[PDB]
Amino acid sequence: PSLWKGLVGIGLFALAHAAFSAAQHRSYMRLTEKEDESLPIDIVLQTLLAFAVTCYGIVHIAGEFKDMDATSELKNKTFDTLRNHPSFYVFNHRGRVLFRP
Amino acid sequence: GVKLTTQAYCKMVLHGAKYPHCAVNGLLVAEKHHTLFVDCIPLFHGTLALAPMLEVALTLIDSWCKDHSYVIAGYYQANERVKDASPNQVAEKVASRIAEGFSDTALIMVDNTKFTMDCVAPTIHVYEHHENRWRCRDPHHDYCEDWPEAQRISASLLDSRSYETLVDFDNHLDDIRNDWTNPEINKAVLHLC
């Protein structure tokens, strides 16, 4: 139902938070002038999890497939609705008499 | 007179009212005044000038009536125009076909002008087979077993919007699980007297 929208929103928010955290960590590291290139593992895990969750959630809202067989939706069509022509309607019948003559 | 019963009249009115914009027709059976009818079976609505489905329905209904010791004796039709109440070729052909197996068969035409909500008249024209033609035997007669009860029951059924459950032979052909004997209408007319 509508839970997939919440799931994808949560995933996007988590990805944005991970981005902000990585940027802040890089800005702090450039101050201390340390050439160790220390990337925390928790940030990588968080961003990978958020990306996976977001992709899984967004794959379920793109829509639904439909059969390509042209004779698939006419299995339930009946001749009652096929003989009605809206352009040639005429209002001269007993329906007027029955209801408030 | 033919002295139509109450069930046949009520079912005929309901079938005529279910599809106001179309033309409907059915069958009348009698037990094996003059000839008392028992009930009616609605056959078709829409386009009526086609042979095969009419033949299949006639055969099935004839076999069913033969099983329960009945006989097809009447044919009722209602046109589409509000100012048209005369028989056409299809009705004459079917009535002539029926007449060869049962004498003094009836050709009933529904009159759209008198198709009022509760009742103003029996709104029925009865035609009898004289030589090779049909004549309107209408001496302002009363072609009902008891007019007041019949009109009261028909008015109550029409007011109750009970025509949404009536099923004819066309709906049976669309889906086999439907029933063209209409037990619900029989129960309703038995309870409501």
From Swiss-Prot, chain A:
Principal localisation: endoplasmic reticulum
Lumenal membrane side: 21-41
Family: Belongs to the membrane magnesium transporter (TC 1.A.67) family.
Entry's Gene Ontology cellular component terms: early endosome; early endosome membrane; EMC complex; endoplasmic reticulum membrane; Golgi apparatus; Golgi membrane; membrane; plasma membrane
UniProt key word Secreted: no
Encoding gene, per UniProt annotation: MMGT1
Molecular function GO labels: cobalt ion transmembrane transporter activity; ferrous iron transmembrane transporter activity; inorganic cation transmembrane transporter activity; magnesium ion transmembrane transporter activity
Official protein name in the record: ER membrane protein complex subunit 5
Full-sequence range covered: 3 to 103 of 131
Biological function: Part of the endoplasmic reticulum membrane protein complex (EMC) that enables the energy-independent insertion into endoplasmic reticulum membranes of newly synthesized membrane proteins. Preferentially accommodates proteins with transmembrane domains that are weakly hydrophobic or contain destabilizing features such as charged and aromatic residues. Involved in the cotranslational insertion of multi-pass membrane proteins in which stop-transfer membrane-anchor sequences become ER membrane spanning helices.
GO BP terms: copper ion transport; magnesium ion transport; protein insertion into ER membrane by stop-transfer membrane-anchor sequence; tail-anchored membrane protein insertion into ER membrane
Bilayer-spanning residue ranges: 2-20, 42-61
Superkingdom to which the source organism belongs: Eukaryota
Membrane topology field: Multi-pass membrane protein
Keyword Transmembrane helix in annotation: yes
Compartment annotation: Endoplasmic reticulum membrane; Golgi apparatus membrane; Early endosome membrane
UniProt subunit comment: Component of the ER membrane protein complex (EMC).
Keywords recorded for this protein, A-Z: Endoplasmic reticulum, Endosome, Golgi apparatus, Magnesium, Membrane, Phosphoprotein, Transmembrane, Transmembrane helix, Transport
Swiss-Prot record, chain B:
Location within or outside the cell: Endoplasmic reticulum membrane
A Pfam family reported for this protein in Swiss-Prot or TrEMBL: UPF0172
Alphabetized PROSITE patterns for the sequence: MPN (PS50249)
Entry keyword DNA-binding: no
Name of protein: ER membrane protein complex subunit 8
Subunit architecture: Component of the ER membrane protein complex (EMC). EMC8 and EMC9 are mutually exclusive subunits of the EMC complex.
Gene field: EMC8
InterPro entries: EMC8/9, MPN
CDD domains reported for this sequence: MPN_UPF0172
Natural source organism: Homo sapiens (Human)
Topology relative to the membrane: Peripheral membrane protein
